[model samples]
Target: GSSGSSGWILASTTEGAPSVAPLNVTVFLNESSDNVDIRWMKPPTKQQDGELVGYRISHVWQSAGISKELLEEVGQNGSRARISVQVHNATCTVRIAAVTRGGVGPFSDPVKIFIPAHSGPSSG
Candidate 1:
């Protein structure tokens, strides 16, 4: 016969409501050019407790006088996400939200980054 304690199991908890949105959302132009790096702080509560499971990223921009929106996802372990877009010389806006087993949370305040027309400074 064998008698031993079982290991712990992690699972989601849907009690009152889902986790809240991520905070302090920010974006920047990566050194590689045309690449935007987006980051945010996790929710103040229920993140490690398994209530929060994933992240949703929104990337919006204008090209050739047209508006566009791109949605992406990030895992629950980290606080950063990176993306490369074809918006040279245009400004791109980004926002992030937290996801739970129940549903998605609100979106963070939007942040903007400008991608230069060229990889380097202008030469004239």
Candidate 2:
């Protein structure tokens, strides 16, 4: 036997109003000589047939200890951006989302990247 659940599902309209669709997201990392690059992407939202609210990024570090950080919105235009940080932390996980007139979309799936430990400074 199986149990049943109840919920409401959205239906299309006839007024020719474009239905709002969920934003699609992707995340990745790039290795470099100085720091690691984290990135995300999503479609822009329409407002006054003008600019959008841009996107926001949030991240969590899952090393030996748990730490979290949130980044400000990058303005609604670019598809990608990068942040440079020293490679001393263990690892990091990130979530990014698009903001629109309607609201902010759910954060994308977490993307994990490793940051190597920095060796101690040389003492001559």
Candidate 3:
């Protein structure tokens, strides 16, 4: 995530050729019922000069209008990235973004889920 400025000799820029925004994002509560799953659609038809590296997912847990942790990271997706945890503390909202050479695009709308106040001991 190094972003450096580059200068040109005589090159001109075209607005149409600018980098396109990253993909559409998708987030949900996984089957384990213990954590949230976050992902995004592919980027726009446009592509940057180099390889499309990956993405970043960020989230925070809140209770009684208080923010808990500020979790943020870079990832590759179902193939090699994303974070998961057994959130016994309960969850509020989650979000994801598509990252490209241009920069991190807009984040997807937040997905809100409710976790019960408490879970009893498991028989199994």
Best by lDDT: 1
Rank by lDDT, highest first: 1, 2, 3
Candidate 2 per-residue lDDT, tens place, 1-105, comes to 236565657764333211232245554554435444445544443544333456667665666665656474565677665666533556777677666544555
Q: In model 3, which regions exceed 4 Å deviation?
A: 1-24, 31-33, 45-51, 77-82, 85-91, 118-124
Candidate number with greatest TM-score: 1
Error of 1 at 31 (Å): 4.9
Summing lDDT over every window of 10 consecutive residues in candidate 1, give the lowest-scoring window.
12-21
Could you tally the backbone clashes for each prediction? 0, 0, 0
Which of the two candidates, 1 or 3, achieves a greater TM-score against the reference? 1
Model 2 misplaced stretches (Cα beyond 4 Å): 1-30, 44-51, 119-124
What's the TM for model 3?
0.56
- lDDT string for model 3 (1-124, tens) is 2485676568644433214434555566655555555556665544434444565556767766455765567644452234455244566666666565545655666766564544566737
RMSD of 2: 9.5
Residue 46 of model 1, lDDT score: 58
TM-scores vs. true structure, each candidate: 0.70, 0.56, 0.56
